[PDB]
Ligand SMILES: Cn1cnc2c(O)nc(N)nc21
C-alpha cells in the first residue's frame with residue numbers, strides 16, 4: 001500500500017498478460033479486448049479494457065482493464081494499466097524507444113481526458129477504439145474535458161487514430177454493465 | 190516491474206519516508222515548501238524535477254506524497270500527481286477522495302499539471318489544487334504540458350476544485366533551473 005503504488009491484477013488479467021498471443025487483424029485485436037471487458041465486469045471492475053500490441057506483427061505486449069473500484073485508485077483506467085504494464089515488460093517509459101517495435105493501443109472505448117494524455121506520453125504510434133465517447137456518456141460515465149479536436153491533437157503528434165471498431169459489441173457490453181449496475185439484487189446479473 | 194500479478198511502482202527511500210512520517214503543515218506556503226524539499230530529493234534520486242502531496246485541506250495533515258518516477262520507474266504515467274493521488278486513495282481506502290465523511294483533500298503540486306494529471310485530478314475527488322511553477326516555467330526547461338483544454342483552470346473550478354497558482358513560484362523555478370542546468 002504505502003511503500004509502492006501497487007495495483008493488483010485479477011487472475012484473468014494475469015492470464016492475459018502471461019500467455020503469448022498474436023492477433024493480426026484489427027477486429028481480432030478488438031475482439032480479444034472486448035473479451036477482457038466482459039471478464040473484467042464479472043470480476044468487479046469497470047466495463048473497459050485495452051491492450052498494447054506490436055502494431056505490425058500483432059504480438060500482444062500487455063493488457064489492462066479498469067480497476068478503479070476494486071483497486072481503490074481513480075487512475076486505474078484500462079489504458080493506464082495496459083500502457084504501464086507494456087512499459088514495465090519492455091523495461092522503458094517510452095514505447096517509442098530506439099529498438100522497440102511500433103506499438104498500438106487497442107481500447108474498448110475512446111479515451112477520457114486523463115487517458116488521452118497518457119496515450120500521448122506513452123510512445124504508442126496508434127490508437128484504436130471501439131465504443132465512442134457518446135456511447136460511454138450514454139450509460140453515465142464522463143470523458144471529462146478533452147481539448148477541442150483531440151483526435152487531431154493525436155494525429156499532429158504522429159499518433160494515428162481509428163474509432164468505431166466493433167462498436168456494436170462494445171456498446172452491448174456497456175449496456176450489460178449498466179443493466180447490472182444498481183443495488184437491487186437481480187438474479188440474471 | 191518484476192511482478193506479473195500487479196502494476197507496481199517502487200518509491201525511493203526519501204519518498205517511502207515522506208509517506209510514512211507524521212507531518213501537519215497548516216499554512217499553504219509550509220505545505221508547498223515541503224513539496225519543494227521533495228522535488229530536490231527526487232532529482233538526487235534520479236527522478237524528474239516534480240513532486241506533489243495530498244493534504245487534508247483544513248488541518249494540513251499530510252496524507253501522501255508523490256514525485257515524478259517516469260524514467261527510473263519505467264512508467265510514463267508516474268507523474269508526481271498520479272502517485273500522490275493514488276497513494277492518498279490507497280491510504281484512505283477509497284478510489285474517491287470526496288467519499289462521504291472523508292475530510293476535504295487538497296493536492297499541493299510543484300508545477301501546474303500536464304493534460305494527463307489534469308484528468309487525474311478531476312477523477313480523484315480532491316477539492317483543491319495548489320501549484321507553484323506555471324506552465325510556462327515548465328516548458329521553459331523542455332517538459333511538455335500536452336494539449337490541455339483551453340481554460341483548464343475554469344474546468345477544475347466548474348467541477349468544484351478550487352485552483353491557486355504561483356505559490357512559491359520563484360523557489361520552485363530555482364529548482365527547475367537547477368535541474369535543467371545539470
Ligand atoms: C470514462 N471512463 C471511465 N473509465 C474508463 C476506462 O477505464 N477507459 C476508458 N476508455 N474510458 C473510461
Ligand SMILES: [Zn+2]
Pocket residue numbers: 077078079111112113114115116
Ligand atoms: Zn481514462
Ligand SMILES: [Zn+2]
Pocket residue numbers: 268269270302303304305306307
Ligand atoms: Zn502530469
